[PDB]
RNA sequence: GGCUCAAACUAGGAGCCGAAGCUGCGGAUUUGAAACUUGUUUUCAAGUGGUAGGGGAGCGUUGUGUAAGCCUGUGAAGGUGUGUCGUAAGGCAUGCUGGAGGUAUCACAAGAGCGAAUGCUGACGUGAGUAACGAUAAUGCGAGUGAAAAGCUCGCACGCCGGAAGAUCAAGGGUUCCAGUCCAACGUUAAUCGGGGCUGGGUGAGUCGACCCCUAAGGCGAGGCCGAAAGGCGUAGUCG
RNA sequence: CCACUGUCGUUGAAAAGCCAGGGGAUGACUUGUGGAUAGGGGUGAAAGGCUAAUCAAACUCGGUGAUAGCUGGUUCUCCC
RNA sequence: UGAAAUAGAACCUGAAACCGUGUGCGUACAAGCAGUAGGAGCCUCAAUUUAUUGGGGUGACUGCGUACCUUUUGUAUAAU
RNA sequence: GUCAAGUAAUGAAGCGCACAUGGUGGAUGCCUUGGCAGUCAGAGGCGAUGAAAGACGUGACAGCCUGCGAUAA
């Protein structure tokens, strides 16, 4: 059946991306956040 | 100071599965299973202990019993007998008497046979 | 003097070996390998070519008369396992255990 | 029960078991010498040889009664060709079965079907 | 369904006792000489002082 | 089991068996009692089943001082046997393994003792060489190569799809595409084969698509309005 | 596009399917792409349905080692 | 080669579970927590003037004997 | 010697125990390149001269890491 994901690209760096994070004051804050923990993969 | 008690767990384990030697199966590989099977034979042994007491004096009690009636009488007139005759051998070497040297035994039964 | 020969790895379990080595172990170098020529088995090849090294290494490095040969002691142990997933229904997974084998063989007078 | 049948099943159809002996007969009337399971070989004496016996008288009734049976005119042609007047003497068993140990990829027994006389 | 207790080693391997590996019947083909299963051609095809190849 | 002037019942009598009870012998221990007097010694008396629980005495482990000591390549720790000692926890000695550390004594401090918590992690069992090997469209044979061929290549034949199980894309993926080479792992079997490993190659646009111009929904939004702060809304616009 | 009946499957081929039938099939239809509504909130031809296999109050992190008159477990030895 | 190669690259030491191989003894007429107290036989080492003891392995046969923990008035409990 | 009656021993498809010798496994012991808690001092910022974090490059040498930035170990 129709299974939960179904990918798009345009979707998912419309939703989850770089710019998405920084136009918002906690999208901003996720990021610190994820640079404070040291990963390797800030956005999607 | 941490402790680490693998060293002493070892060896404390060890000591109860050398002293589960001759277990069938579990009773003597694995520590859990031979721990209570230890435990278990201590037991045993201390009960037994107590019977093994009891268990032989059934046994002489029985010989002496076979000997007084292959001449004369049974064991209780036998044992009457002795006691009249104020005779303390224990029932342990009456027993080895009867089973071992007849022709002595045969005088015992006389010396009791004539007190009653 | 006993030659030895080991097959570490061998990539079978040991169960389905020590089946064909129960029928070699203790034949005459002759009788055993037309056993293992003849089986059927998969462990068979294994045994044979574990045999066979066992065989040359008496003729080579030992200088010895493999005509008057034996097998004189052989044992298949446990090797090292490799484990997998195997799916399930219902989003379950089970663990696989691929096992290998070690195999053993020493020939002697 | 299966008291006094006869007939393979070999894990087939029977459309697919009529197709798969069709197709032994032709090869082994091409090659003369094939290799098969010991099962497959003892049941393809029940269709090759019957086949050959018709041969030994040749006509057009039993030459189209073959192809029906073949359907391969090469081998049809073959079979009445130089089968036919081969084994026109010999009172059956026009091949003979040898085994051949087992088979590699799942230890089935293997036995050749080859043609007596020159095959 | 499943066991209520593992079973002994002991249990196991006579369960094992009737596990053993078949033994081909051989023999020596009369002209080439060779060992081959009995019943069966040789490797290099003799059966029964007969060619196949 | 078997039992009938009993091996049943009643009333008496005498033996004997019968418990971890009592006694006999040896040993330990608590409390109290005459003293070389702190277990310095000989005894005696009464005790010594035990959950919850209270009291007392100790064993072992890691670390600190003792210790720039003592032991140790003539073999430390650890491992694995054996002997021996103590009421116990446990101690000592020693064979083998091991190869570089250990620690007397007395104090001192604890991550100080595990069988259970449907405890946590890892390893390995039993079930069991059992179920199963994923659409019942289907395979047979001959050559080739190969260590090995039911599964690979070629050939003949057979079967299946054919509003697809054939083709072109978008989305998504990202090299899976082609060739050579290898078969450990992966492929629910084998594999010489592969979407597997390795090494090379391959995608050519004014016209196809994107980019670009334009805008929809909907965003963001000089100034503007509103709101403790954060921010919310909104015009021109600017994106989409 | 649905999901009425039955068998099968129930450590499944499948964490909802297959098969044989079944309903709608120009419409209050089905579907692609993008966008909007966010948790006591949303959305709901209304079943407390759905809101990422989670729903009579999502998920993640934090308060937090919440509390638990409850259940389980609680590790060397001997003496009174 | 190396002191060492059951230090050989999954490499120091290499425990247990678990799985093999060899040797000794027992085991195919006998009913159960698998032990314990006895105990014949056999096998193997050390002494001993030579089967006499002692140590080790096995355990025919006999008696007795329903795991552990927890929780309970009370558990072999078919209660955890 | 023949018969009769009575009664031993011998077995092992496999299994148990002990020992010997292995496999698996990775405990333990020893070890450390890594952490944990502090003391005494210092410092408490970086950025429109483009920061923090990255992306892509850069070598004789294929990858990754480290450094560096088309003046590119």
Redesign the pocket.
Known sequence: ?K??????????K??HGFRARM???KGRQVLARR?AK???R?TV | ???????????????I??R??????????????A???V????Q????????????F??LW?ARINAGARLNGLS???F??GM?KANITID?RVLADIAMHDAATFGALVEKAKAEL | MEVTAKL??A?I????V?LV??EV??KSIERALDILTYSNKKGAVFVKKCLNSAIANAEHNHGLDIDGLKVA????????????I???????A?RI???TC?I?IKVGE | MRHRKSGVKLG??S??RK??F???T???F??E?????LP?AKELRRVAEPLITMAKEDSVANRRLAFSRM??K?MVGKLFGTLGPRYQNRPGGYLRIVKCGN????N?PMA?VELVDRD | ???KS???????????????MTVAELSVDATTGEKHRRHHMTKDGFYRGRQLF
């Open positions: 059946m299974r939960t994901f179904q990918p798009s690209v345009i979707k998912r419309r939703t136009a918002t004051k640079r040291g990963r390797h800030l | 100071a941490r402790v680490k008690r693998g060293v002493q767990a070892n060896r404390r384990h060890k000591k599965l050398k589960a030697k001759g277990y069938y199966g579990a009773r003597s590989r694995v520590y859990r299973v721990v209570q099977a435990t278990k034979a201590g045993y042994a201390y009960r037994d202990r107590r019977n093994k007491k009891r268990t004096r059934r009690i064991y209780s007139r044992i009457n006691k029932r | 570490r790895g990539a379990s040991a169960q389905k020590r080595a129960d172990r203790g002691t052989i044992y298949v142990d446990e090797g090292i396992t490799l484990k997998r195997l799916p399930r229904a219902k989003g379950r089970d255990s691929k096992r070690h053993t | 087939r159809t459309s697919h197709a798969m069709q197709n032994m032709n090869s082994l091409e090659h010498l094939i290799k098969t399971t497959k359907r391969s090469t088979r590699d990829g799942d089935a050749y | 369904a499943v066991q593992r079973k002994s080693r002991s249990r196991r391997d006579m369960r094992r006792s009737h596990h053993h």
